[PDB]
Design a protein around this nucleic acid. Sequence first.
DNA 1: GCATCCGTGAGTCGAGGGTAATAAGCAGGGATTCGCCCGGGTGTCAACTCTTTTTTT
Length: 40
Amino acid sequence: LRTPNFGRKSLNEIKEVLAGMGLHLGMDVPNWPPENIEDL
DNA sequence: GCATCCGTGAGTCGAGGGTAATAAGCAGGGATTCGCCCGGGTGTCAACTCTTTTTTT
């Protein structure tokens, strides 16, 4: 919500599509693979 | 009633890989065919106006 044009209806669809992919809010270390070592 | 002459046959699977020779001449007129170019229908882009789903007030 602290971003310009924070889509109220799109924030729910994006969370739904993220949960459908297998990921959710948090559930991991904060920026674990933040380097280029995780690039495939 | 017999003697003489003309058609069909020849197993079946496999290998091995392409070929080869003669050789007139020129004048008339048409049909054919290749280069350039204008062009009109097909694409690829700057650029002017309604609607509305919110995101902001």
